[PDB]
Every structure is written in structure tokens, then in C-alpha cells.
Design an enzyme around this catalytic site. Structure first.
Site, PDB file in Angstrom:
ATOM      1  NE  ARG A  56      -2.460  -1.676  -1.029  1.00 16.00           N
ATOM      2  CZ  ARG A  56      -2.143  -2.931  -1.337  1.00 16.00           C
ATOM      3  NH1 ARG A  56      -2.230  -3.885  -0.419  1.00 16.00           N
ATOM      4  NH2 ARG A  56      -1.735  -3.238  -2.564  1.00 16.00           N
ATOM      5  CG  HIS A 108      -9.081   5.549  10.774  1.00 12.94           C
ATOM      6  ND1 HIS A 108     -10.064   5.502   9.815  1.00 12.94           N
ATOM      7  CD2 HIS A 108      -9.721   5.505  11.975  1.00 12.94           C
ATOM      8  CE1 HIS A 108     -11.241   5.436  10.411  1.00 12.94           C
ATOM      9  NE2 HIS A 108     -11.067   5.425  11.720  1.00 12.94           N
ATOM     10  CB  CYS A 135      12.229   1.885  17.658  1.00 20.30           C
ATOM     11  SG  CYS A 135      13.030   1.482  19.241  1.00 20.30           S
ATOM     12  N   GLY A 175     -17.148  11.087   0.852  1.00 21.13           N
ATOM     13  CA  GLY A 175     -16.526   9.831   0.469  1.00 21.13           C
ATOM     14  C   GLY A 175     -16.542   8.782   1.559  1.00 21.13           C
ATOM     15  CD  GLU A 203     -23.396   3.492  -5.165  1.00 20.11           C
ATOM     16  OE1 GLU A 203     -24.348   3.301  -4.373  1.00 20.11           O
ATOM     17  OE2 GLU A 203     -23.387   3.044  -6.335  1.00 20.11           O
TER      18      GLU A 203
HETATM   19 ZN   LIG Z   1      11.401   2.531  20.535  1.00 15.99          ZN
END
Ligand SMILES: [Zn+2]
Lengths: 235, 9
Positions: A56, A108, A135, A175, A203
Site C-alpha cells: 500500500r 486512522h 526503532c 466519500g 454513492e
Molecule cells: Zn522505541
């Protein structure tokens, strides 16, 4: 003069080439949402889930993907209204930012960000996430996950969103399908606190009947038409 | 407020 809150969903980016879960079959890119957008799914098969978000994330940055005229209109709307405008999106794409909107609330999350699974610190991230990617915020480095809110997780920016829902004079949902909560319930909150509610969609949404004013058609035609109507109306 | 992200059905 009016305070305007816009909520966008996946429909606005359809003409730009970005697809989403089409609740007709509950498939997103032919994957069950259970498997690619839940904490369980990520626990069960993190390799597949990371691969899914990698795909994505790559697709979002392809040259053929561009903001469309609906995105541009919303940037013009912010330009016109300044601090009395807020844009909240359910979308994980960056098309609002590319169009020129600033201070966008991604309830989101964002496909171009990842999160330390231990500290919760968020990083800009445009490439693949591999298991080697840990990280840099923890003494004991932790795996990174997409900074994308999954089904079963709490959306982001909710205190600010609910504040804006109350404050809005005009609430425009663009949307959205009406099937994803809490976002699909925002129209009710907006109405409760006195806003005029508008749906702009290809729609009609599941909740479309709750909206006072509504226009349907391709977003790239409907959204600019509405933004023009609104700005003319405001003088 | 609002609860977690969830789909109708
Ligand atoms: Zn971390």
C-alpha cells in the site's frame, strides 16, 4: 465566518486510484479485513501484514497517483476559512497534504508513518518495513509497525475531533461509507451540537439519510461544485 | 469517547 469541519473517507481518493475495503465483500485488495487490519491479524502473521502495508505504501507514491480536483477544492476551502476550518480524514493516504491542506487530523493514522511498538513514538517512513527495521527511540530496540489504526484500536485525535464536532457550524462528510465507527457516528454528534450537515459522495452512505444536504456523483465534480457553492454563499 | 475503530457487522 462559519466554522467548517470536513470528514473524508476513502471515496474521495477513488479517482486518484486508491482503493479500500469494499464492504460488499469485506475485501481490501482481496484480503479479509480480519487478516490485514486487526491487532490479531498482525499478531498471527506479521510478515503478511507488513507486506500488505508495504505494498500500500509503495502504491501510494507511484507517479500515477495524484490528488484530484476534490482534494484541491478542500485545500481552497481551508485557504478561504483559515482557523475556522478543520479537516479530519479516515484516510491513510497523503493526498490532502499534497493538495495543500495543513493540520489534517488522520484519525486512522498515516501510511507514510510508522510507530515504535514499545514507546509509541511515530516516525516518517516512506519505504518498506522489514524485520530488521527496529526503532531508534528505545535502549532495547523494538519492532516498528504501521502507524495505522486497526479495527479494535482507538482512533487518533479524538478529543480534538469531538471538540470540532461540537464547534462546527457546517459538517461535511465526503466519500464515507457509513460502515466504519466511530467516524460514521460523527454526523450524529455534529447534528446534536447544531451543525448543518452535508454528505458529498459517489454513492449514498449507510447514514446518508441523517444529513441535511447531499450531493452525489464523482468526487472530482461534486466536491469542487459544493466548495464553490459554499464560498459564494459565504460571500 | 467514541470507542474503538469497528465495522458495522
Ligand atoms: Zn522505541
Amino acid at each position: 465566518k462559519p466554522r467548517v469541519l470536513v470528514l473524508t473517507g476513502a471515496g474521495i481518493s477513488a479517482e486518484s486510484g486508491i482503493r479500500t475495503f469494499r464492504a460488499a465483500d469485506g475485501l481490501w485488495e482481496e484480503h479479509r479485513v480480519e487478516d490485514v487490519a486487526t491487532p490479531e491479524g498482525f499478531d498471527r502473521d506479521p510478515e503478511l501484514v507488513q507486506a500488505f502495508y508495504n505494498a500500500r505504501r509503495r502504491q501510494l507514491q507511484q507517479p500515477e497517483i495524484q490528488p484530484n480536483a476534490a482534494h484541491l477544492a478542500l485545500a481552497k476551502l481551508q485557504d478561504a476559512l483559515g482557523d475556522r476550518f478543520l479537516l479530519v480524514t479516515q484516510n491513510i493516504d497523503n493526498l490532502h497534504e499534497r493538495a495543500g491542506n495543513t493540520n489534517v487530523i488522520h484519525m486512522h493514522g498515516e501510511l507514510l508513518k510508522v510507530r515504535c511498538s514499545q514507546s509509541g513514538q511515530v516516525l516518517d517512513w516512506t519505504g518498506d518495513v522489514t524485520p530488521e527495521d527496529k526503532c531508534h527511540c528505545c535502549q532495547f530496540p523494538a519492532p516498528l509497525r504501521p502507524h495505522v489504526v486497526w479495527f479494535g484500536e482507538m482512533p487518533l485525535g479524538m478529543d480534538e475531533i469531538y471538540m470540532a464536532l461540537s464547534m462546527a457550524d457546517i459538517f461535511i462528510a465526503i466519500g464515507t461509507s457509513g460502515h466504519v465507527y466511530p467516524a460514521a457516528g460523527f454526523v450524529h454528534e455534529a447534528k446534536l451540537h447544531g451543525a448543518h450537515t452535508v454528505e458529498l459522495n459517489l454513492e449514498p452512505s449507510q447514514v446518508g439519510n441523517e444529513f441535511a444536504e447531499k450531493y452525489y456523483g464523482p468526487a472530482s465534480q461534486v466536491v469542487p461544485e459544493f466548495v464553490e457553492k459554499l464560498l459564494k454563499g459565504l460571500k | 469517547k467514541g470507542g474503538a475503530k469497528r465495522h458495522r457487522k
